[PDB]
């Protein structure tokens, strides 16, 4: 949970 | 830093969705390797944009986003249910990598999502059990446990939830990549860069893993490695  | 607040927002479920496009079977591309451990593109992107994007129910529009339902009720751990979308308050600030993949009682989703992380329900915190950077694997719950596993020589489809959208469910067949240990065969793709944590489903429901690491090369196609479940070597006795 943050960029991919 | 981090690991104070990442929370999690079911969007649909880790399976097979009827949005199968063809996009895959990208043939031969250069990806630069980084001495042999690590691989990329040399072109800085950007693109942390997944969860909300609309009235979808799940967000905030000021901490994160959500679809959890822990009831007080005979509930103790969290479980929505599928595949999520799951957003962050760190390192860079709210930002969404999108998939986080629950199936019966496990979550199993990517390393490269954070450097192994706690989650929680926006100030409500659970901790996982597993982080494994080798493979690139983290698990919820317990040791990972599934049964398939895809790999370079069968065709399958990646479960991908699109920003403020429906799970984009690719079709995508072997591809590889020359490199100077000669080609690395891997999930090769022709699209946007897919969600973080993203499984690896078949048409009917089957192997059901996760896209390994990689990165948007030709600043356009989405090439990672394949990512499977092996069953989590418990040589260690559970108990006794």
């Given at each position: 949970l943050k960029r991919x | 830093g981090s690991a104070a607040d990442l929370e999690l927002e079911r969007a649909a479920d880790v399976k097979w969705e009827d949005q199968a496009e063809i996009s895959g079977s990208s043939p031969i591309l250069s990806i630069t390797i980084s001495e042999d451990g690590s691989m990329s593109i040399k072109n800085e992107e950007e693109e942390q944009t997944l969860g909300g994007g609309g009235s979808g129910g799940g967000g905030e529009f000021a901490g994160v986003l959500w679809d959890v339902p822990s009831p007080p009720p005979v509930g103790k751990a969290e479980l929505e249910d599928g595949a999520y979308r799951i957003k962050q308050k760190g390192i860079l600030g709210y930002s969404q990598i999108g998939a986080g993949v629950y199936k019966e009682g496990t979550?199993?989703?990517?390393?490269?999502?954070?450097?192994?992380?706690?989650?929680?329900?926006?100030?409500?915190?659970?901790e996982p059990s597993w982080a494994d950077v080798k493979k690139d694997l983290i698990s919820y719950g317990g040791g990972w446990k599934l049964e398939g596993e895809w790999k370079e020589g069968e065709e399958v489809q990646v479960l991908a939830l699109e920003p403020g959208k429906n799970p984009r469910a690719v079709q995508t067949?072997?591809?590889?990549?020359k490199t100077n240990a000669g080609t690395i065969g891997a999930v090769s793709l022709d699209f946007s860069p897919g969600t973080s944590g993203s499984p690896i489903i078949d048409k009917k429901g089957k192997v059901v893993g996760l896209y390994g690491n990689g990165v948007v090369t030709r600043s356009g196609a989405y090439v990672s490695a394949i990512a499977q479940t092996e069953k989590s070597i418990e040589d260690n006795p559970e108990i006794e």
């Open positions: - | 979550f199993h989703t990517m390393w490269h999502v954070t450097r192994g992380a706690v989650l929680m329900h926006k100030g409500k915190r659970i067949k072997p591809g590889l990549f």
